[PDB]
Subunit: 59 residues, 6 copies
């Protein structure tokens, strides 16, 4: 399984390290797949690179 | 947050519904973000559309 | 520019042909880029492959 | 609907803010979906991270 | 390394198996990375799900 | 054809220029598609943005 998570810039390294571990276990147990096969990719978005309803994430 | 998970075809609806819930909570609690903002997308791959080390996932 | 839009299954061919044209012009004029360089990709999601807040798109 | 647009680095913030608004309305009206549900993500590519026909975007 | 290739529907299984092997070696040797670490994902697009310059891939 | 390759940060410009050329030819010849139609996108991941088996790529 391969997960790509898009998050807004601003979290700490520990926070993202945690996210990678948590999401990785959730996939593993949800699909009964070996954890070692799970691959996660975090992609940060600049507050000005994310639109919601037409408005920027930043405002 | 927006997560897109790529999984091989073959799981049941219940299994994928569980995956979407689990992964969704893991992201929420890991980033302290409201669950209602989390968006998950499952993309299934045909066993013959996934390569590992050059070999097909199917063989 | 290359845009990949994820939409829930259910629209008509005409609707998606329109989406591809509209979005393609919006990118072109917004970035002053030649329309001929714009590439759009539509990816449909099964109602049961899209989660929002942990719940399935379908329910 | 969720759109991810890949563009080469170099545009101004106003230009990208415009792109996000324009593309967001185009999707909304094309699919008759509520604007508030539209999510756009801009991903910039370094001129040396984009290949066209085998050649770099930069040259 | 993880590559996701978007191709129009229509190729044979042998053709796609070849694509996965070729592209997988090209990445391996280009980055001097172990072939066993390379992961490829093929995503087919319906001729009516791909726009070029605003026009559908099919026409 | 459109390929998006995710690689860990650290390679040189020449190395990535090579990757773009190699992968681009591999796709071209594998699918008998004109090279000029091939589009490659490299996306670098920070060592702390890639998880394998739950552990960070960096450790």
């Amino acid at each position: 399984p391969i997960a790509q998570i898009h998050i807004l810039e601003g979290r700490s390294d520990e926070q993202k390290e945690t996210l990678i571990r948590e999401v990785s276990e959730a996939i593993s147990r949800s699909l009964d797949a070996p954890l070692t096969s799970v691959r996660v990719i975090i992609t940060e978005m600049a507050k000005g690179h994310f639109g919601i309803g037409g408005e920027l994430a930043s405002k």
